[PDB]
Design a protein around this ligand. Structure first.
Ligand code: U83
Length: 128
């Protein structure tokens, strides 16, 4: 599946190079620009557990998911991963728990020590 493909072919985009966030570009984006710390970023996403059985998608609305990049408003893996993305890029991320919900998890949906997968489409980004 797409998770195993990220395991096997994904780029490790962590500073520690600990394979905690692995990335495949599924669709190439436009130009060269990637978002700055503090930029408002606008994405669509589909997320799911690898180990267990849980799925959620932003397209559950015609409303992009928005956050401020690099401010700890989202799990660590998203701050790391979305920073690398160009406008219009789709990427797959496979995320070890250290870069997500760790040993606590987020009960009941997300167990302890859970690996997560996301497909992210970076729609746009804009400064304050
Ligand atoms: C700085 O570290 C963290 C920052 C923020 C969080 C909270 C979870 C945080 O979730 C996320 O960071 C990730 C990436 C952004 C999309 C949502 N995220 C999820 O994990 C979602 C997943 C879907 C499928 C999965 Cl499998 S996991 C998760 C699904 C159930 C609700 C919690 C979000 C979050 C940020 C902003 C809004 C939000 O929900 C809507 C709302 O509140 O309006 C939830 C956890 C953090 O660490 C555990």
């Amino acid at each position: 599946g797409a998770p195993a493909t990220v395991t096997e072919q994904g780029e490790d985009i962590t500073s520690k190079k600990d394979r905690g966030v692995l990335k495949i570009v599924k669709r190439v984006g436009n130009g060269e620009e990637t978002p700055m710390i503090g930029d408002k970023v606008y994405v669509h996403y589909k997320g799911k557990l690898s180990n267990g059985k849980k799925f959620d998608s932003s397209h559950d609305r015609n409303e992009p998911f928005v956050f401020s990049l690099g401010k700890g408003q989202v799990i660590k893996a998203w701050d790391i991963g979305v920073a690398t993305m160009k406008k219009g890029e789709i990427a797959h991320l496979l995320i070890k728990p250290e870069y997500a919900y760790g040993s606590a998890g987020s009960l009941p949906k997300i167990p302890s020590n859970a690996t997560l997968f996301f497909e992210i489409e970076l729609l746009d980004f804009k400064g304050e």
